[PDB]
Each structure stands twice: as C-alpha cells, then as structure tokens.
Amino acid sequence: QSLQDPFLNALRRERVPVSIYLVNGIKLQGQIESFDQFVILLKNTVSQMVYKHAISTVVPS
C-alpha cells in the first residue's frame, strides 16, 4: 500500500475531482470521501461505495 494509500489520501484530503474508470468501461466522477482495503467511497450528488476489484484506473479529472 506504499503507493496506493498516499495516492488516494492526497486526492481525499485536497478534495480533488477524480475520474474512476471501471473494468466494464464506465467512468465515474466525484470526490474521494474515504477508502479502505476493498472499497472507495465516492461522493458527487450522492455517496456511493465502489469496489476496488471493479476499478481499472483512478486519475484526477
């Protein structure tokens, strides 16, 4: 986690808009509210739990 956690934490603390690309090709957008070992809590109009196993890539918007 020596790279993943710092990467997600900096986006979380700064409240950067991010794009989360899922394996099926769908792109989600919002702010990272928090995360744990298996999930990311992504907030836009509502708070959704995204399973990391479904994510291909995370990048600031």
Partner RNA sequence: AAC
Site size for RNA, by CB under 7 A? 14
Give the Cβ contact number of residue 16 at 10 Å: 12
Tokens of 60: 């600031």
Q: Which of 21, 34, 39, 52 binds RNA (CB under 7 A)?
A: 21
H or E stretch at 45 = none
- Binding site for UMP: what residues are annotated? 4, 37-38, 52-53
- Residue 27 binds: one of RNA, its own copies, none (C-beta under 5 to 8 A by kind): RNA
H or E stretch at 14 = helix 4-14
Q: Which residues lie near RNA (CB under 7 A)?
A: 19, 21-22, 24-29, 44, 48, 56-57, 59
